[PDB]
Amino acid sequence: RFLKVKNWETDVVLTDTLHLKSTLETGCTEHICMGSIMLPSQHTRVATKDQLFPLAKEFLDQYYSSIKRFGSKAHMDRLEEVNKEIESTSTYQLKDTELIYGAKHAWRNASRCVGRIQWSKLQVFDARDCTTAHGMFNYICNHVKYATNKGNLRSAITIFPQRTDGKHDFRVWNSQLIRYAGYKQPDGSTLGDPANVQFTEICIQQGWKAPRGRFDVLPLLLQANGNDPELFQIPPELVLEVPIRHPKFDWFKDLGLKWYGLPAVSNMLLEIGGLEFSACPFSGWYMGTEIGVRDYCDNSRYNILEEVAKKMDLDMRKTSSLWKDQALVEINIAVLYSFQSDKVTIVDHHSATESFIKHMENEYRCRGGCPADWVWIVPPMSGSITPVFHQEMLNYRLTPSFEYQPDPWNTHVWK
Amino acid sequence: RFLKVKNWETDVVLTDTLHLKSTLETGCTEHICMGSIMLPSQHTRVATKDQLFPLAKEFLDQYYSSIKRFGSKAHMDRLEEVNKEIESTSTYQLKDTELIYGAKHAWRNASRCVGRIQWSKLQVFDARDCTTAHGMFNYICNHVKYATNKGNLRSAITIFPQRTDGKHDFRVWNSQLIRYAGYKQPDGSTLGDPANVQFTEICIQQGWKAPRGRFDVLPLLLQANGNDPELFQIPPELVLEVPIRHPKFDWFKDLGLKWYGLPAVSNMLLEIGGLEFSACPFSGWYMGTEIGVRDYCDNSRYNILEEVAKKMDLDMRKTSSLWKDQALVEINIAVLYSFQSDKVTIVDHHSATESFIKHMENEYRCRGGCPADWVWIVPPMSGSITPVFHQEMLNYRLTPSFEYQPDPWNTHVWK
Numbered sequence: 001r002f003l004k005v006k007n008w009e010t011d012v013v014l015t016d017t018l019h020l021k022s023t024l025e026t027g028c029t030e031h032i033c034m035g036s037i038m039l040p041s042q043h044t045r046v047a048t049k050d051q052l053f054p055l056a057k058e059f060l061d062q063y064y065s066s067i068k069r070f071g072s073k074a075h076m077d078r079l080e081e082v083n084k085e086i087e088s089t090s091t092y093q094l095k096d097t098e099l100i101y102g103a104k105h106a107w108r109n110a111s112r113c114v115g116r117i118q119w120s121k122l123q124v125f126d127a128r129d130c131t132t133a134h135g136m137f138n139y140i141c142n143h144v145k146y147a148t149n150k151g152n153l154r155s156a157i158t159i160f161p162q163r164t165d166g167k168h169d170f171r172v173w174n175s176q177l178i179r180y181a182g183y184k185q186p187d188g189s190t191l192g193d194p195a196n197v198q199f200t201e202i203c204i205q206q207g208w209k210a211p212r213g214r215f216d217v218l219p220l221l222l223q224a225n226g227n228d229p230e231l232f233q234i235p236p237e238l239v240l241e242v243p244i245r246h247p248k249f250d251w252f253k254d255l256g257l258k259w260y261g262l263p264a265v266s267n268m269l270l271e272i273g274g275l276e277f278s279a280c281p282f283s284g285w286y287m288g289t290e291i292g293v294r295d296y297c298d299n300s301r302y303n304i305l306e307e308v309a310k311k312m313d314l315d316m317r318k319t320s321s322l323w324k325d326q327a328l329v330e331i332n333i334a335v336l337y338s339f340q341s342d343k344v345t346i347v348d349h350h351s352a353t354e355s356f357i358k359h360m361e362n363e364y365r366c367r368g369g370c371p372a373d374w375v376w377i378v379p380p381m382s383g384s385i386t387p388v389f390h391q392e393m394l395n396y397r398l399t400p401s402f403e404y405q406p407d408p409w410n411t412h413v414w415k
Numbered sequence: 416r417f418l419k420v421k422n423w424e425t426d427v428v429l430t431d432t433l434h435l436k437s438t439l440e441t442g443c444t445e446h447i448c449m450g451s452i453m454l455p456s457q458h459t460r461v462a463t464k465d466q467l468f469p470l471a472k473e474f475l476d477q478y479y480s481s482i483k484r485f486g487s488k489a490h491m492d493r494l495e496e497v498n499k500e501i502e503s504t505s506t507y508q509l510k511d512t513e514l515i516y517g518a519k520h521a522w523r524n525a526s527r528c529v530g531r532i533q534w535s536k537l538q539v540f541d542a543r544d545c546t547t548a549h550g551m552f553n554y555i556c557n558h559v560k561y562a563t564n565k566g567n568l569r570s571a572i573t574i575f576p577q578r579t580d581g582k583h584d585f586r587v588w589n590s591q592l593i594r595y596a597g598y599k600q601p602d603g604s605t606l607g608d609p610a611n612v613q614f615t616e617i618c619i620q621q622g623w624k625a626p627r628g629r630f631d632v633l634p635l636l637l638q639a640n641g642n643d644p645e646l647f648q649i650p651p652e653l654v655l656e657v658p659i660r661h662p663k664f665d666w667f668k669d670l671g672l673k674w675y676g677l678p679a680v681s682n683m684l685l686e687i688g689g690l691e692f693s694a695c696p697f698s699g700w701y702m703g704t705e706i707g708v709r710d711y712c713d714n715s716r717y718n719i720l721e722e723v724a725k726k727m728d729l730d731m732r733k734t735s736s737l738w739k740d741q742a743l744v745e746i747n748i749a750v751l752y753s754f755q756s757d758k759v760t761i762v763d764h765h766s767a768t769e770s771f772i773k774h775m776e777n778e779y780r781c782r783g784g785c786p787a788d789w790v791w792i793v794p795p796m797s798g799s800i801t802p803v804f805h806q807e808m809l810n811y812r813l814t815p816s817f818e819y820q821p822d823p824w825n826t827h828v829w830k
């Protein structure tokens with residue numbers, strides 16, 4: 001019942017008891033493993049009043065058995081206080097300290113995040129008093145400015161009012177606070193980011209005048225209390241960008257690449273003691289491979305392997321010349337070199353994966369485990385020369401948690 | 416119940432119904448996914464007479480509903496014939512055609528093997544009349560000669576007598592038919608392959624005179640009908656080796672690397688209609704990354720990244736210089752280039768993973784699915800620039816199957 005996970009490069013063994021506390025389901029059964037399914041039903045997110053108190057009680061018991069005040073009067077009266085308020089309101093409200101705890105532990109419990117060694121250093125911005133989409137823009141601007149810190153990136157999350165009935169929902173329609181626009185050409189090809197071709201069309205549909213270039217920062221589409229969303233442009237002095245150059249190849253500058261400094265996910269859902277926060281933008285800093293491998297070299301994204309292979313002068317006729325691999329490594333050296341020379345926080349996949357193994361060590365000692373998703377933790381290049389490749393990992397779903405949710409434009413009852 | 420798997424690079428969707436036929440268990444539960452555990456209990460392998468007929472019946476029903484002769488007289492009489500013989504003997508014997516079918520479908524069902532597009536082109540060598548360890552050596556030599564085919568590698572498997580009581584067991588003690596010896600130095604470091612340091616000691620323990628160099632081909636340790644195993648040296652003209660050189664870097668020859676052409680796994684167990692074949696060496700051809708990434712660059716194997724980085728003249732002080740990544744790509748270009756120039760069959764990880772996607776297509780059409788283990792299918796370098804990275808895969812255990820088994824020297828009752 002008390003499972004073991006092995007590291008096959010060092011022979012370290014760790015014992016996991018934290019999985020006992022797991023509540024949610026994974027998708028796998030005794031006869032089928034769905035560990036490679038991207039969005040199983042369980043990882044996506046309507047609740048009723050009856051189900052709310054056990055989830056509150058369970059969460060309150062975690063928080064008071066955290067500040068080592070479990071079962072005492074301060075715990076019991078808060079237990080009864082929330083109980084009474086769930087009877088009275090069919091919902092409840094978190095204390096500011098409970099919100100900060102719940103949000104840090106959602107990140108802590110994110111099994112697909114290799115960055116969690118930082119989970120306790122998270123700045124939490126309480127935006128539950130927000131009522132309008134202008135208010136949201138203002139809070140989101142303050143988040144971007146704080147988290148960027150002129151390149152000394154700081155982790156942060158901003159938390160808008162929780163879902164109540166469901167038809168009144170705060171939502172950030174962008175998938176990330178800062179993304180580049182996707183424009184499809186009249187012939188068929190794509191300028192900018194093909195991922196956002198659909199979102200770019202919704203913004204033009206709502207009034208955005210597109211500068212139709214490559215790296216056009218998208219406006220924000222903010223929806224408040226269920227109302228229709230409104231467009232706002234992030235003041236460009238708040239959007240820190242890094243021009244990508246190589247430390248050997250001087251043709252690399254003329255490639256004309258740049259990325260943004262701040263990775264800030266805005267389309268997910270924060271769940272805390274049964275409450276649902278449909279708009280909770282959170283940001284950290286990049287691991288290099290996110291830009292250099294996935295953003296730049298995915299076939300359905302920017303897809304630059306061939307142009308980089310061209311200017312490197314490469315054997316591009318054969319697949320076994322490994323020209324794709326060779327050009328991929330140079331692109332990622334340039335991503336790292338550019339962010340570092342500009343003093344914009346970035347981490348390479350060797351540093352990040354070492355830290356995660358060190359984070360797993362700590363989590364099995366002082367916590368009894370660390371839910372981890374190997375499929376997402378192992379970086380998308382050079383997998384087996386990083387220590388996470390050889391580390392067995394148990395995946396399981398703890399709460400508080402970040403979850404996926406459907407896009408707002410498939411569900412919003414317009415008017 | 417009839418699950419869907421998505422490809423996130425092409426948007427192809429496939430429907431899996433084959434998982435319904437699954438019998439064995441995976442290790443995962445509704446509340447925990449063990450998709451990254453290397454050797455769960457279910458993937459390792461004693462049976463009694465009562466359990467044997469449903470497994471025979473189930474297997475016979477697959478084979479006759481294969482040559483489109485299901486339920487007929489030829490099926491029913493073989494059903495009753497095996498039934499009677501399980502009553503009479505508490506076991507049974509496969510027809511030669513049933514053995515060839517069962518072995519091809521064990522490979523077909525191997526969810527961790529990216530090579531299965533070839534599953535029906537498998538040469539099956541029936542060695543069930545073998546009685547002595549000399550006999551085994553002779554059969555294993557004929558396998559090596561056939562499968563190598565002077566560099567035009569051909570897939571093959573040799574099948575020794577099935578387990579009966581358990582204390583009489585044919586076993587190949589080597590983990591692969593051809594491996595290099597592992598010698599630990601008096602100071603502590605290691606020459607050759609550190610993986611086989613333990614096995615190398617068992618061979619010296621039994622009489623092997625070690626040439627104590629780097630790439631010393633190990634003798635065979637063959638155990639027949641439970642007797643103690645005996646050493647035999649594969650005639651060196653039967654062991655095809657490829658010296659590793661680079662097509663640009665002429666210092667690469669002086670690195671002094673070579674590998675063997677034939678990957679031939681000998682420590683696993685073939686299960687067919689309930690029968691257990693404890694010695695079933697099977698061979699194919701290499702995917703380049705097996706040698707170039709894992710064999711050469713694993714920290715606990717040959718571990719050559721630093722010496723290759725040295726001669727490349729690399730920024731080795733920092734982790735973020737990606738010198739490890741850069742030297743890894745060159746090692747794999749050289750592995751491919753050397754095998755190809757010598758006309759020894761090899762496949763690169765781009766060709767192999769494309770073929771597997773094409774194999775999955777066929778399997779979902781004419782079979783209803785294809786059990787696949789993403790953790791093992793995705794290659795250990797450049798993962799996301801190969802199409803398997805973006806393909807969702809359902810893992811489940813079908814029979815006939817290859818399974819792991821404990822090492823013989825932890826279980827053999829000596830004398």
Ligand code: HEM
Nearest residue numbers: 107110112113114115118155157282283284285286287402
């Ligand atoms: C501090 C620096 C951080 C680093 C280096 C980091 C690293 C990463 C990386 C590389 C991914 C994979 C993204 C992808 O493949 O698309 C990821 C996923 C994720 N990260 Fe972190 N992250 C950081 C901060 C944070 C913060 C502050 C939070 C939450 C407050 C967070 C929560 C998540 C979640 C929820 C996911 C993916 C969840 C899913 O897909 O189910 N991360 N992280």
Ligand code: HEM
Nearest residue numbers: 522525527528529530533570572697698699700701702817
């Ligand atoms: C024909 C050329 C073949 C290629 C290119 C190929 C490719 C591969 C590769 C790269 C692996 C991973 C090995 C590792 O990471 O250590 C693998 C695993 C495997 N292959 Fe194939 N293979 C081939 C032939 C075969 C044959 C002929 C069989 C059986 C008769 C087979 C059965 C297996 C099994 C059972 C495993 C791993 C099972 C496990 O660990 O549970 N392969 N294959």
Ligand SMILES: C[C@H](O)[C@H](O)[C@H]1CNc2nc(N)[nH]c(=O)c2N1
Nearest residue numbers: 036037038375376804805806807
């Ligand atoms: C099919 C597969 O699950 C999918 O491509 C996953 C694989 N692992 C990943 N891992 C990370 N970190 N990010 C991703 O987008 C993905 N994609």
Ligand SMILES: C[C@H](O)[C@H](O)[C@H]1CNc2nc(N)[nH]c(=O)c2N1
Nearest residue numbers: 389390391392451452453790791
């Ligand atoms: C911990 C992890 O399961 C282990 O390192 C696995 C990962 N995937 C692998 N995949 C292949 N093909 N071969 C391996 O040896 C491994 N090792």
Ligand SMILES: Cc1cc(N)nc(C#CCN2CC(F)(F)C2)c1
Nearest residue numbers: 263264265282283284285286287
């Ligand atoms: C906070 C954070 C840090 C980081 N280093 N990266 C990301 C990211 C991302 C984008 N992907 C799509 C997703 F699944 F939402 C995450 C987010």
Ligand SMILES: Cc1cc(N)nc(C#CCN2CC(F)(F)C2)c1
Nearest residue numbers: 678679680697698699700701702
């Ligand atoms: C037939 C075959 C083909 C191939 N291309 N590779 C292998 C291999 C290997 C060694 N690994 C350890 C294992 F799990 F047994 C497989 C085997």
Ligand SMILES: [Zn+2]
Nearest residue numbers: 028033443448
């Ligand atoms: Zn699973």
